[PDB]
Ligand binder design. Structure first.
Ligand SMILES: CCCCCCCCCCCC(=O)OC[C@H](COP(=O)(O)OCC[N+](C)(C)C)OC(=O)CCCCCCCCCCC
Ligand SMILES: CCCCCCCCCCCC(=O)OC[C@H](COP(=O)(O)OCC[N+](C)(C)C)OC(=O)CCCCCCCCCCC
Ligand SMILES: CCCCCCCCCCCC(=O)OC[C@H](COP(=O)(O)OCC[N+](C)(C)C)OC(=O)CCCCCCCCCCC
Ligand SMILES: CCCCCCCCCCCC(=O)OC[C@H](COP(=O)(O)OCC[N+](C)(C)C)OC(=O)CCCCCCCCCCC
Ligand SMILES: CCCCCCCCCCCC(=O)OC[C@H](COP(=O)(O)OCC[N+](C)(C)C)OC(=O)CCCCCCCCCCC
Ligand SMILES: CCCCCCCCCCCC(=O)OC[C@H](COP(=O)(O)OCC[N+](C)(C)C)OC(=O)CCCCCCCCCCC
Ligand SMILES: CCCCCCCCCCCC(=O)OC[C@H](COP(=O)(O)OCC[N+](C)(C)C)OC(=O)CCCCCCCCCCC
Ligand SMILES: CCCCCCCCCCCC(=O)OC[C@H](COP(=O)(O)OCC[N+](C)(C)C)OC(=O)CCCCCCCCCCC
Ligand SMILES: CCCCCCCCCC(=O)OC[C@H](COP(=O)(O)OCC[N+](C)(C)C)OC(=O)CCCCCCCCC
Ligand SMILES: CCCCCCCCCC(=O)OC[C@H](COP(=O)(O)OCC[N+](C)(C)C)OC(=O)CCCCCCCCC
Ligand SMILES: CCCCCCCCCC(=O)OC[C@H](COP(=O)(O)OCC[N+](C)(C)C)OC(=O)CCCCCCCCC
Ligand SMILES: CCCCCCCCCC(=O)OC[C@H](COP(=O)(O)OCC[N+](C)(C)C)OC(=O)CCCCCCCCC
Ligand SMILES: CCCCCC(=O)OC[C@H](COP(=O)(O)OCC[N+](C)(C)C)OC(=O)CCCCC
Ligand SMILES: CCCCCC(=O)OC[C@H](COP(=O)(O)OCC[N+](C)(C)C)OC(=O)CCCCC
Ligand SMILES: CCCCCC(=O)OC[C@H](COP(=O)(O)OCC[N+](C)(C)C)OC(=O)CCCCC
Ligand SMILES: CCCCCC(=O)OC[C@H](COP(=O)(O)OCC[N+](C)(C)C)OC(=O)CCCCC
Ligand SMILES: CCCCCCCCCC
Ligand SMILES: CCCCCCCCCC
Ligand SMILES: [Cu+2]
Ligand SMILES: [Cu+2]
Ligand SMILES: [Cu+2]
Lengths: 241, 382, 236, 123, 236, 51, 52
């Protein structure tokens, strides 16, 4: 067994660090695959960071892993940082690839290929779960906040890129000029799923409407992925594959 | 560079690039190189490619070794997707600014919404200098000049590092105490209600309130600075002005077209009728970025890429001048190593063995006529 | 002794090999790696593909066979101290699996995103995919299978049955590799675009979700750790 | 039959249903086209038919009129701008093998449910 | 006696009747059967439809009612030998059901495929469908219901409850008949084509899957066979 | 349109680019039958071995 | 043009004019392949007798 209380504590600390590494990097891999293949196109390009599709899609598809990891970590250890660890791992993987591949391998500028910020939503999700331990309350209120705070959380970063520029006779934002100048041979302009206007776009409502739709869909996706993570937390054994 | 892989018939019948020109072959950092030319949208546009209702004038290149300063279709700037009409000819112009030193193969390409990339001829352009000398200045409507290479980079780094630090602080605050096995055992063995106690709830309330307040304050501050912002400018642009070409005075009818398997030559029998009032002579056959030239009739002086240029690759059985009103049938052979290098011979693998191309007819004075030909391409094995 | 310096090697081997792979693809990405029908593409990337596939098959066979042959027959007469040592070794295996999963499913997957967004897709065997689909994915598959086999053959907790969360954690991410068939099919037939969020990529997404079974796997390993040498201290 | 034989033998050997779903279904998907190639290969001999290139199967479909089945209904390979080299058959075969893994996994449990032996007290 | 020559009749009646039906549709397929508004279409196929629907309703009523009225009241005092005899009779019923299912769901269904691929669909009541939707499908439905009723009323194993696999095996393939509404709706409103793999046909597919309940039904009949006269020999 | 004669007299010859003339009525029919019968026999042999 | 500015119940008012479909039709709007000539009004305060 273990020699004494002290050796047991040291063993528990070593296990803590190693298991934290395992959880963090398995989450990084899986969450990054999911994110980059469900929101990566918007996350890649400043001229894709629009008010309709980026704001709508990103929180919805990104609340998945935080919900599952929360349903496991909070329930089994009372550790209220499942959402934060998921978001931090995603941001770390994204930034490593942006810096060493998007800017390292190819030479796209960082101010063009920066990722979106998600920590505010993760913090809301985690604190709303720890306080008021109800998973239903989290899925309703915290996921609402996660969806709603996405665009305001990223506005300090992207706002300077939205300064209007008179570019060769046409009006373009700085992000538009970045996308125009830094040629993406594989990514033509029409692939861009961004706000283009509609006849039913009333007033100045594009960003808030998208944010509220994302918050509602985030409630739904959090509810589903809480139970998905519950299943993934099972400890069953099989007698035969 | 991504061509030689696409289907030969698809490369033959989508878009025909001609009158291509390059302002320079070798440039310094920050120097501009301009690519001009015309492209014709083939009438027999393959059904597997969506019609070019939404098309983007792009540049084929290994990442931003150049930046696209300007691009024009007709005479107007096209930073967005454009609508093209099948059968129309458009003139284009792309202005590129050198950014990264090296030898780069630059293609003019057209991306079509539901068909994928249509890559035109590529030319090797040498860039010399240092990437550190590259500047991309723009002047905003708010009266400030910024360099797009590093503008907002510090702000982006700062905000991302700040939020990452907040998340790491949360995790570390909870990670000071033992993490996994003792907490699991406490939760399992009896009610836990001991690993989360004040001031843990107070710290969480502080984290939540600070997060919301900081987001609100940062948004307000980023609104006071940069008070003038516009959304991303997007949307397909209609009304591209096509070229007003005169009707050709040469009519060509393709009677059978064959290519040997294996081989590097394509043979076709054409019935050419010369209208107008000047003797004509066949000078060029362009099929897919490959120009087969009859050297006795026409010579290329625009610096066309050598691996795509067959100076004497076009042999006409009777290439004597064709008097006006006269109709004659000749055997035309287009032979060059490019036919196999660019895998034009791999049309035998294609599910649609039809070719298309452009014939260029020249009179004595030097003025030229462009006629388009398309026919089934029959392989010959025996 | 307990936790030894095998963890240092586990981190360092992946780190060094993948740093060299990144250097290799930085040197031969363009210039022998852009034109898939060019002769130097064959000697710098097709040869890489052949060598890496052969070495992966050989290494998987040798490692899995050795782990299965050296399996502990008398698991009943295993002392708690040796059980704790084996639990730490299994945790080192899980650390190696997590590191390999990171390198495969985050780094080289998004790296292939950038590559395919900046160049024209030229083949099914581009330099980026050679490094992602056929090197990093097989490497993490081999590591995960080895960790599963080690748990089953040395840990009495993971013996006497196949752990469902471990099986999911090991096989789901493996299914990303045959899913490449959907990727190639969905890039050549469906979606004449380079949209990274296209439904042709949802095969990676769905089977990337199965890595969430690491949660059940890790609570199982915690219970295996806390069998005889659970303390005391812990809950005392 | 070749795919069926692979599926059956891979199950009897290595009794694992998971191993069958992964390896045997892979083989079932992959061996389909090579298994049928000896039959359809003679129908793919090229023919110069009234000025156009057609395979023998194409001429069969053209000649033997299917009033209810016009040509455009045919869901066959027609070429794309992203069809790189000679990859159409292998790419389709590997996609079919992966999807066969998935469908086998689902239908194993579907068959389990259909093999249930329950009784109901009332419909 | 045990298994008697009712099995020969069970095979032969379906074989002979459907061979005659095939001869009839070969003779009157074209030439009174191509034009649905022609007068001879009414006397050769609409009359066929009317007669077959009336006869199917009458035969179903008579057969099911007789089987239910002659149901065994004193199932407790049934000897194992008579139980074995009744199990063999029920197996003959299942053989007849399988034969009718073959004729309905394979022969005439693909035969309707060919017909609808070679001619222009002219009506909802074409000769092919008259033989497939309104003859062969009702015939196998009647046979399946009769087999289910016989099991429930003569076999103590299948008494005292409704067997779920048997109910699925009997009712699912029945649901293919009301599914014809989707077929006609999906051919006149959806899909102006003759694609046999169109989603308008997935109603037949889904309810054709329910015939897989024959596996549970057959293990139930095996257990019913092996109640008292299970052997010995079997496992001895 | 009235057609007279016998279906047995119908011929559908085509000449391939490989220099062989075949009748589309029966070309490849024997090969198709052979391969299908061979694979069916293999499957039946498997089932009968277990049966 | 408008035939009248002030009408009685059951009285007819006629609205005439021309409309030109702009060449640079925005891509977010589907092409007017299926279009309906409608009247903007707060419910059936008028009935549409005819439209041409
Ligand atoms: C503290 C208690 C009192 C306040 C309560 C909130 C009332 C609304 C405030 C509007 C402020 C504003 O700015 O208007 C809204 C702005 C537009 O503004 P505008 O362009 O100036 O339009 C001027 C013309 N109006 C006056 C007619 C607007 O965007 C929007 O359309 C946002 C639309 C969001 C739709 C989805 C909401 C889902 C809610 C879910 C709840 C669980
Ligand atoms: C626990 C939950 C915390 C939520 C914190 C919310 C911070 C407030 C942000 C102000 C929004 C704004 O200022 O206006 C809306 C702007 C969009 O502006 P734009 O179209 O980009 O215009 C560009 C010009 N700018 C720079 C001036 C904007 O941002 C958004 O679309 C996000 C809208 C979400 C706000 C919903 C809050 C309603 C209360 C929630 C009730 C249940
Ligand atoms: C359970 C639900 C509780 C509701 C609580 C609402 C508190 C609002 C706090 C102030 C937000 C603000 O002022 O900002 C809202 C911004 C305004 O955006 P803007 O005008 O485009 O630009 C920015 C202009 N500023 C800088 C002056 C703000 O975004 C929106 O358009 C969203 C407004 C619609 C909200 C609909 C909520 C319906 C609730 C129904 C309850 C029965
Ligand atoms: C889980 C089991 C995984 C199995 C697969 C492993 C793949 C290994 C790489 C394949 C290389 C190939 O195939 O290419 C062979 C290359 C082709 O380069 P060259 O033209 O000779 O140029 C000169 C060589 N440079 C360009 C590398 C300088 O040359 C070689 O011989 C060298 C290959 C060295 C690989 C071993 C070092 C790895 C980093 C150190 C920490 C481990
Ligand atoms: C768990 C995975 C194990 C992999 C084992 C692979 C063994 C290959 C056996 C030879 C096949 C052959 O030679 O044939 C392959 C044929 C070639 O087709 P072709 O060139 O069009 O024409 C026919 C030309 N012949 C007649 C000369 C063959 O089809 C293909 O294109 C498929 C090739 C891609 C396979 C990708 C596998 C990736 C594995 C990754 C492992 C980490
Ligand atoms: C025995 C161990 C070593 C061999 C291992 C296999 C390596 C690949 C061999 C290629 C042979 C060949 O023929 O190439 C592949 C041929 C094309 O060939 P081509 O037209 O000549 O193109 C020449 C230009 N290239 C050299 C750039 C190719 O089709 C294909 O694109 C097949 C693509 C299949 C995609 C889906 C694969 C999913 C794998 C799942 C694994 C679990
Ligand atoms: C247990 C699994 C058993 C699998 C047996 C496979 C038999 C090999 C067939 C050779 C393929 C070929 O020769 O090339 C590919 C051809 C396609 O050619 P095509 O485009 O029709 O060209 C027409 C001209 N021909 C006639 C020359 C072809 O066939 C296929 O697309 C099927 C590809 C599947 C091969 C995958 C094998 C890789 C190893 C599996 C690893 C995990
Ligand atoms: C599960 C319960 C199923 C119930 C439905 C059964 C449908 C029966 C057929 C309907 C016929 C109809 O409706 O047509 C009536 C037909 C119309 O042909 P005709 O113009 O008189 O030409 C002369 C008749 N020939 C063309 C048949 C030669 O004539 C008849 O009287 C003859 C019908 C004979 C049916 C009985 C023989 C069946 C094969 C022997 C093994 C059983
Ligand atoms: C009818 C729906 C209206 C909203 C109520 C939903 C909350 C239900 C959550 C629940 O089931 O109870 C969990 C805890 C129990 O803690 P208690 O020991 O009851 O603490 C009571 C003292 N307190 C007011 C400071 C909380 O109690 C809490 O969850 C926190 C209660 C305080 C409300 C505000 C917390 C949420 C902050 C965003
Ligand atoms: C993409 C969808 C996510 C996959 C999750 C599905 C898991 C389904 C559960 C499962 O696999 O059941 C196993 C049974 C075999 O049972 P046994 O081997 O008898 O185990 C006894 C205990 N047990 C019955 C509770 C399992 O059924 C079997 O026949 C064995 C098959 C086991 C395969 C599960 C591995 C899944 C890896 C992808
Ligand atoms: C980690 C994953 C790597 C692949 C291994 C997956 C196979 C697992 C299947 C399984 O659960 O075990 C079932 C049988 C058990 O039979 P045993 O009695 O263990 O036979 C051992 C002797 N043998 C090597 C000839 C088999 O053992 C077998 O299934 C057969 C074992 C031999 C491997 C090759 C069989 C497959 C042929 C295509
Ligand atoms: C297309 C989808 C495939 C169909 C498979 C679905 C089968 C669902 C299972 C089911 O039917 O449950 C029966 C219960 C009635 O229960 P009871 O009649 O009380 O039987 C007692 C034992 N039992 C509760 C386990 C059944 O629920 C009821 O109320 C009776 C309804 C039974 C209908 C099942 C027949 C399905 C034929 C299509
Ligand atoms: C946790 C993942 C770390 C990924 C770092 C990476 O990709 O490094 C490659 C990149 C390459 O850029 P650079 O350092 O300038 O060296 C260029 C060499 N090539 C072109 C071969 C990559 O930078 C380094 O090598 C820094 C070493 C970090 C050690 C953890
Ligand atoms: C879980 C959500 C899945 C939604 C699928 C989707 O977005 O598909 C878009 C695509 C519409 O094609 P589009 O985006 O116009 O593709 C343009 C590029 N091409 C024409 C080359 C495919 O629709 C389909 O072809 C059917 C997808 C079936 C999913 C099981
Ligand atoms: C296991 C299903 C057997 C289906 C056989 C069939 O459809 O037979 C009709 C067909 C009709 O062609 P043929 O024999 O030439 O006689 C033509 C008569 N009509 C046109 C009425 C079908 O051939 C026979 O009658 C052969 C007898 C097989 C007995 C199992
Ligand atoms: C389980 C897969 C179901 C996929 C459905 C499908 O393939 O539908 C094709 C069809 C596309 O129509 P299309 O194939 O172009 O039909 C051409 C013929 N017309 C125009 C007469 C219908 O889409 C729909 O109309 C929606 C189908 C809903 C399924 C629940
Ligand atoms: C769509 C979410 C369904 C998640 C499945 C969870 C099943 C738990 C059974 C123990
Ligand atoms: C999609 C496959 C689901 C199959 C259902 C099986 C349920 C078994 C419960 C006993
Ligand atoms: Cu190139
Ligand atoms: Cu043209
Ligand atoms: Cu107008």
């Amino acid at each position: 067994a273990v020699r004494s209380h002290a050796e047991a504590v040291q063993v528990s600390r070593t296990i803590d660090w190693m298991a934290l590494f395992v959880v963090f990097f398995v989450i990084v891999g899986s969450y990054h695959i999911h994110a980059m293949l469900t929101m990566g196109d918007w996350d890649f390009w400043s001229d894709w960071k629009d008010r309709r599709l980026w704001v709508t899609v990103t929180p919805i598809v990104l609340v998945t892993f935080p919900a599952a990891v929360q349903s496991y970590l909070w329930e089994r250890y009372r550790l209220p940082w499942g959402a934060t660890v998921c978001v931090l791992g995603l941001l770390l993987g994204e930034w490593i690839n942006r810096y060493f591949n998007f800017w390292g391998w190819t030479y796209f500028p960082i101010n063009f290929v920066f990722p979106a910020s998600l920590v505010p939503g993760a913090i809301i999700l985690d604190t709303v779960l720890m306080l008021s331990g109800s998973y239903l309350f989290t899925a309703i209120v915290g996921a609402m906040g996660w969806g709603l705070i996405f665009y305001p959380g990223n506005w300090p970063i992207i706002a300077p890129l939205h300064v209007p520029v008179e570019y060769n006779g046409m009006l373009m934002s700085i992000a538009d000029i970045q996308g125009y100048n830094y040629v993406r041979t594989g990514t033509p302009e029409y692939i861009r799923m961004v706000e283009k206007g509609t006849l039913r776009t009333f007033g100045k409502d594009v960003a808030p409407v998208s944010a509220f739709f994302s918050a509602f869909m985030s409630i739904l996706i959090y509810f589903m992925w809480h139970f998905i993570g519950r299943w993934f937390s099972n400890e069953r054994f099989l007698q035969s594959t | 560079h991504g061509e030689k892989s696409q289907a030969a018939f698809m490369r033959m019948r989508t878009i025909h690039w001609y009158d291509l020109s390059w302002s320079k072959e070798k440039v310094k950092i920050n120097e501009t190189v301009e690519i001009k030319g015309k492209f014709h949208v083939f009438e027999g546009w393959p059904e597997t490619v969506d019609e070019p209702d939404v098309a983007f004038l792009n540049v084929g290149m290994p990442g931003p070794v150049f930046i696209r300063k300007e691009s024009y279709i007709g005479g107007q700037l096209v930073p967005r997707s454009v609508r093209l009409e099948i059968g129309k000819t458009y003139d284009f112009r792309v202005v590129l600014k050198a950014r990264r030193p090296g030898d780069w193969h630059v293609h003019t390409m057209m991306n079509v919404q539901g068909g994928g990339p249509i890559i035109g001829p590529g030319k090797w352009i040498t860039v010399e200098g240092s990437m550190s000398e590259f500047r991309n200045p723009v002047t905003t409507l708010t009266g400030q000049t910024v360099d797009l290479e590093n503008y907002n980079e510090g702000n982006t780094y700062f905000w991302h590092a700040f939020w990452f630090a907040i998340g790491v602080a949360w995790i570390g605050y909870w990670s000071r105490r033992p993490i996994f096995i003792p907490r699991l055992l406490m939760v399992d063995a009896g009610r836990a209600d001991e690993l989360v106690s004040a001031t843990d709830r107070k710290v969480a309330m502080g984290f939540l309130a600070a997060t919301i307040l900081i987001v609100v304050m940062a948004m307000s501050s980023a609104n006071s600075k940069y008070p003038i912002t516009i959304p991303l400018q997007a949307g397909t642009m209609r009304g591209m002005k096509p070229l007003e070409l005169p009707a050709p005075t040469v009519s060509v009818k393709v009677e059978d077209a064959t290519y040997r398997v294996p081989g590097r030559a394509m043979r076709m029998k054409l019935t050419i009728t010369n209208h107008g009032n000047s003797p004509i002579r066949l000078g060029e056959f362009y099929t897919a970025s490959v120009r087969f030239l009859d050297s006795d009739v026409y010579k290329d002086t625009t610096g066309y890429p050598e691996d795509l240029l067959a100076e004497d690759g076009l042999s006409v059985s009777d290439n004597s001048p064709l008097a006006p009103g006269e109709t004659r049938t000749v055997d035309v052979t287009a032979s060059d190593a490019a036919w196999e290098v660019y895998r034009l011979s791999d049309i035998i693998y294609d599910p649609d063995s039809r070719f298309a191309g452009l014939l260029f007819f020249f009179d004595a004075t030097g003025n030229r006529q462009v006629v388009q030909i398309d026919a089934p391409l029959i392989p010959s094995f025996m | 002794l307990l936790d030894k310096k095998w963890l240092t090697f586990a981190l360092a081997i992946y780190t060094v090999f993948y740093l060299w792979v990144r250097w290799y693809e930085g040197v031969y990405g363009w210039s022998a790696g852009l034109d898939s029908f060019a002769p130097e593409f064959e000697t710098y990337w097709m040869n890489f593909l052949y060598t890496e596939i052969v070495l992966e098959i050989v290494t998987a066979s040798i490692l899995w066979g050795y782990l299965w042959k050296t399996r502990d027959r008398n698991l009943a007469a295993l002392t708690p101290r040796e059980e704790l040592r084996r639990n730490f070794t299994h945790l080192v295996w899980l650390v190696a699996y997590a590191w390999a999963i990171y390198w495969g499913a985050s780094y080289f997957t998004e790296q292939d995103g950038t590559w395919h967004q900046t160049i024209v897709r030229d083949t099914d065997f581009t330099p980026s995919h050679i490094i992602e689909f056929y090197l990093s994915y097989p490497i993490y598959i081999i590591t995960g299978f080895a960790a599963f086999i080690y748990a089953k053959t040395r840990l009495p907790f993971f013996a006497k049955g196949i752990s469902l969360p471990y099986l999911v954690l090991v096989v789901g991410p493996f299914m990303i590799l045959p899913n490449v068939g959907l990727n190639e099919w969905g890039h050549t037939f469906w979606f004449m675009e380079e949209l990274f969020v296209a439904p042709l990529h949802y095969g990676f997404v769905i089977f990337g979700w199965l890595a969430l079974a690491v949660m059940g796997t890790l609570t199982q390993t915690f219970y295996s750790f806390a069998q005889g040498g659970l303390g005391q201290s812990l809950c005392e």
